[PDB]
Amino acid sequence: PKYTKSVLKKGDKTNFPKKGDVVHCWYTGTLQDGTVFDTNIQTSAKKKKNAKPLSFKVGVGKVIRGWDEALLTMSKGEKARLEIEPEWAYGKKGQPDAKIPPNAKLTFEVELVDID
Numbered sequence: 001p002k003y004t005k006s007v008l009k010k011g012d013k014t015n016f017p018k019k020g021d022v023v024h025c026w027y028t029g030t031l032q033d034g035t036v037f038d039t040n041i042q043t044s045a046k047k048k049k050n051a052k053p054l055s056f057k058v059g060v061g062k063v064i065r066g067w068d069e070a071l072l073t074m075s076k077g078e079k080a081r082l083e084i085e086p087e088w089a090y091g092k093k094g095q096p097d098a099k100i101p102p103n104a105k106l107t108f109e110v111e112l113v114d115i116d
C-alpha cells in the first residue's frame with residue numbers, strides 16, 4: 001500500500017468499517033515542513049458535533065486512496081497517523097487551489113469517531 005500508519009491511540013478493536021459504510025472523522029493534515037495545511041479539529045467547540053466531523057463513505061473513492069485504504073484497518077476510537085505517498089494522494093500535479101504542492105507526501109492524524 002503506499003501509505004504508512006502508526007497507531008497513536010488504540011480503538012475499540014471490534015468495529016471496523018467495511019466498504020459500505022459512512023465514517024465520521026476528525027483530522028489534521030501537515031505538509032513535509034510541518035505546516036498544517038488543514039484541520040477540522042476545533043478549538044471553539046466540538047460541542048455537539050459543532051463543527052461536525054467529516055463524513056463520507058469508505059472504499060468507494062470519495063476520498064484520496066491513502067485514506068480509503070487506511071480507514072478500512074481502523075477501529076472506532078482509533079487515532080492514527082498516516083503518511084501517504086504523493087501517488088495515493090494528489091500526485092504529480094497536486095492541488096494548487098487547495099494548498100497542496102505538486103508531489104507532496106502528506107501526513108494526516110485521523111481519528112475514527114463513529115461508523116454507521
Ligand SMILES: CO[C@H]1C[C@@H]2CC[C@@H](C)[C@@](O)(O2)C(=O)C(=O)N2CCCC[C@H]2C(=O)O[C@H]([C@H](C)C[C@@H]2CC[C@@H](O)[C@H](OC)C2)CC(=O)[C@H](C)/C=C(\C)[C@@H](O)[C@@H](OC)C(=O)[C@H](C)C[C@H](C)/C=C/C=C/C=C/1C
Pocket residue numbers: 027029037038054055056061062063064067095098099100
Ligand atoms: C472545506 O473542506 C473540504 C475538505 C478539504 C478539501 C481539499 C483538501 C486538500 C483538504 O484540505 O480538505 C484535505 O485535508 C484533504 O486532503 N482531505 C479531506 C479529508 C479527507 C482526505 C482528503 C480528501 O480526500 O478530500 C476530498 C478530495 C478533495 C476530493 C477527492 C479526490 C479523489 C477523487 O476520487 C474524489 O472524487 C470522488 C474527490 C474532499 C472530501 O473529503 C469531501 C468530503 C468529498 C468530496 C469533495 C467528493 O467525494 C464528492 O464526490 C464528488 C462527494 O461525494 C462529496 C461528499 C459531496 C459533497 C456535496 C461535498 C462536500 C465537500 C466537502 C469539502 C470539505 C469538507
